Write an enzyme that holds these catalytic residues in place. Structure first.
Site, PDB file in Angstrom:
ATOM      1  N   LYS A   1       0.848  -1.198   0.000  1.00  0.00           N
ATOM      2  CA  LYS A   1       0.000   0.000   0.000  1.00  0.00           C
ATOM      3  C   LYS A   1       0.879   1.243   0.000  1.00  0.00           C
ATOM      4  O   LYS A   1       2.065   1.195   0.371  1.00  0.00           O
ATOM      5  CB  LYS A   1      -0.914   0.012   1.190  1.00  0.00           C
ATOM      6  CG  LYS A   1      -0.247   0.163   2.538  1.00  0.00           C
ATOM      7  CD  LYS A   1      -1.123  -0.170   3.708  1.00  0.00           C
ATOM      8  CE  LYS A   1      -0.464   0.273   5.007  1.00  0.00           C
ATOM      9  NZ  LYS A   1      -1.051  -0.441   6.145  1.00  0.00           N
TER      10      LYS A   1
ATOM     11  N   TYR B   1      14.468  30.709   7.122  1.00  0.00           N
ATOM     12  CA  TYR B   1      13.378  31.482   7.555  1.00  0.00           C
ATOM     13  C   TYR B   1      13.364  31.680   9.082  1.00  0.00           C
ATOM     14  O   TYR B   1      13.606  30.742   9.818  1.00  0.00           O
ATOM     15  CB  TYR B   1      12.060  30.880   7.158  1.00  0.00           C
ATOM     16  CG  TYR B   1      11.858  30.755   5.692  1.00  0.00           C
ATOM     17  CD1 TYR B   1      11.992  31.864   4.844  1.00  0.00           C
ATOM     18  CD2 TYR B   1      11.533  29.531   5.125  1.00  0.00           C
ATOM     19  CE1 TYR B   1      11.743  31.746   3.463  1.00  0.00           C
ATOM     20  CE2 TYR B   1      11.295  29.410   3.745  1.00  0.00           C
ATOM     21  CZ  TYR B   1      11.368  30.510   2.941  1.00  0.00           C
ATOM     22  OH  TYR B   1      11.140  30.406   1.572  1.00  0.00           O
TER      23      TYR B   1
END
Ligand SMILES: *Cc1c(COP(=O)(O)O)cnc(C)c1O
Ligand SMILES: *Cc1c(COP(=O)(O)O)cnc(C)c1O
Ligand code: NA
Ligand code: NA
Ligand code: NA
Ligand code: NA
Lengths: 382, 390
Positions: free
Chosen positions: B45, B282
């Site tokens: 999956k 940042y």
């Protein structure tokens, strides 16, 4: 029709257009660049680029050359006059293909100046080069002083040989999302110094630009010739400190929703999900939302992510799994297949991407950008 | 084509996720040794936990897996449609269904489909009726996880009854009874035994009423590794197949004869000297302590580098481990190289099996306040996969 039954990310391109218009109004002396890197921040690169250009964006911005080349290759074509810039380059990248595709390419270092010059020579077409200044962010960008001196000189020589033109001088802010942070003025000063220097030496860029979204929204002195309001074009505010989308005439573009896979009654004292970090306080109903961290639902939002289901905000119950998570519905019995709205613009009483960001200890940029490829995008108002 | 080979060779320059299928095959062998009573399901999956569904499925089947497991029916259908095909005799199970999903297409593709609820029993029985071919159904029991299965008591009584009526009409066969553990990664947690006892009780009940499943199964990776009494007929060791340990409490990969399958690496985009007192990234959460060199690694949170690993994520560059300096951005992050001057384009190895002195996915999990499952699974589609030892 089939993959959307489980979940979908609805992308309202009319909202995106409305946001571009609002941002153009806010930056009247500048051209607007639609930043569509990272699959348009999870929204879909090409459809968002088209919409933005229709709403008046005259530049497109991407990170990788592959992203910028995909824009140029789109069919039907974007207008041939839209400028497309890319800036994340490594040695040996496809500089020649970029030059032949008439991309604006960023250069922060001599190695890249040499490679792009060599590619322009081999193609027989001049490059469009944007020199990036490191004005204080300390990421990409050429440092001031000798590095900048050398780079400007090499650019001038390449111009003299007809191999390129420097079409721009640009930089990027560290702290523009914190209004009045001293670094902002310091960077703007250094940007003015470095661009003044480059122009004194002889470069004649079409554009100078430094502003991201929070600078676009709060710093008119930083608009220069071009603004690059990425997250705001998707209708998401850069930070609660800057404001809400509504403060700026913005509307979130993405709505992330799913269909309940199971609704079941359980006794009190029943653990829920991995580690049993939630236990039902009494007899209740559980709802199974078929999205998980493989779909971009951040595992950090375990026990806290908000979701509108059956008329009320629910929260994640315990650990988010790879493909699903549970909510305690408190005895309500919606039907299987009932809509669970994780986030959107908020006008239907649903959460916003910013609520998820807070729940997950992150920023809304990460939330929208990392919605997984397993979630189909459904475009509305194309 | 040469134009397609040059395109592939081009995206890998920035970064790549190298997927060693020989490591995956080795893991499958190790897990089959560990669960000698049972068949092994290769859980593929979520694009094989970020590794590539079809290549990993093929490798697992080559190494002895006889079942494939996926979440969505679309994932399972894609395995069936693979060309060249996987062997027609491999069983493929899918479990994450919602009302109105493609039950008829699943029935016609001979998928094993999980059912936890009367709605789904009704839908799959309707689809089998319309297709004229019987469905292969696995009933899921909620034995204590509180997620996907059917609750014990009246709910399970009703579901088993409905299944029996469907069997009597020739519309399906209940091919399995299964469940999933909440706490198997925490050895000796009292819920584990509680679930196994409930599992035994619910499955005994189903069989007493008449159901004859081919397989009973409950074990995930940490149960497969630690709980032979939970192996039953079939084991589903997902994360371990990818060579990653379910938790440090369970152990290291090496403790189980496992080797991490994924290596994540990038090429440096910039190496520059900077003065002291320079902020980095940042918010300026890192400031250079003196004159130094910075390296720009061209991967960011859009590529699955978790933003939570800001100021902490480890990376091997130019012979030493470096840590992320400040905030990870969407497409890049910076490391302080302490004066070292590797060449632009130099290899930065974020994680791998660890034998070349690089970090592991577990080190990033710890850096990011998460589990290694999340690290490998969320590596972004912008990072190309390169398959070795196909
Ligand atoms: C990502 C990016 C932007 C846009 O930033 P926002 O905060 O989303 O507006 C602007 N410029 C550059 C160089 C970028 O990398
Ligand atoms: C994801 C999953 C597995 C494998 O879990 P691991 O911890 O990776 O081994 C097993 N079974 C089901 C039903 C799953 O969803
Ligand atoms: Na800068
Ligand atoms: Na949950
Ligand atoms: Na497996
Ligand atoms: Na269970």
């Amino acid at each position: 029709a089939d993959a959307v039954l489980r979940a979908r990310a609805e992308i309202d391109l009319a909202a995106l257009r409305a946001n571009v218009r609002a941002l153009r109004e806010r930056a009247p002396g500048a051209a607007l660049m639609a930043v569509v890197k990272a699959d348009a921040y999870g929204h879909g690169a090409i459809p968002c680029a088209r919409a933005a250009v229709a709403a008046g964006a005259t530049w497109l911005g991407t990170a990788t050359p592959q992203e910028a080349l995909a824009l140029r290759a789109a069919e039907p074509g974007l207008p041939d006059d839209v400028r497309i810039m890319c800036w994340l380059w490594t040695p040996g990248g496809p500089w020649r293909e970029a030059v032949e595709a008439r991309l604006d390419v960023s250069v922060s270092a001599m190695w890249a100046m040499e490679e792009v010059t060599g590619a322009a020579r081999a193609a027989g077409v001049p490059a469009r080069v944007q020199l990036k200044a490191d004005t204080g962010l300390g990421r990409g960008g050429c440092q001031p002083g000798a590095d900048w001196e050398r780079l400007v000189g090499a650019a001038l020589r390449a111009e003299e040989e007809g191999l390129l033109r420097v079409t721009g001088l640009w930089s990027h802010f560290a702290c523009a999302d914190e209004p009045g942070h001293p670094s902002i003025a310091a960077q703007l000063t250094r940007f003015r110094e470095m661009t003044a220097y480059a122009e004194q030496r002889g470069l004649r860029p079409e554009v100078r630009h430094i502003a991201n979204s929070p600078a676009t929204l709060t710093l008119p002195d930083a608009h220069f010739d071009l603004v690059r309001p990425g997250i705001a074009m998707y209708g998401v505010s850069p930070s609660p400190e800057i404001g809400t989308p509504a403060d700026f005439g913005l509307r979130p573009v993405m709505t992330l929703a799913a269909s309940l896979a199971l609704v079941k009654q359980v006794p009190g004292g029943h653990g829920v999900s991995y580690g049993h970090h939630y236990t039902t306080p009494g007899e209740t109903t559980l709802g199974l939302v078929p999205l998980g961290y493989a779909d971009g639902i951040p595992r950090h939002a375990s026990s806290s992510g908000p979701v509108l289901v059956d008329g009320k905000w629910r929260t994640v119950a315990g650990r988010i799994a790879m493909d699903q998570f549970v909510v305690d519905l408190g005895g309500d019995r919606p039907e299987p297949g009932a809509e669970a709205v994780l986030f959107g613009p908020g006008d239907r009483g649903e959460p916003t991407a910013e609520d998820w960001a807070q729940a997950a200890g992150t920023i809304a940029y990460e939330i929208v950008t990392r919605i997984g490829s397993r979630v189909p995008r459904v475009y509305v108002n194309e």
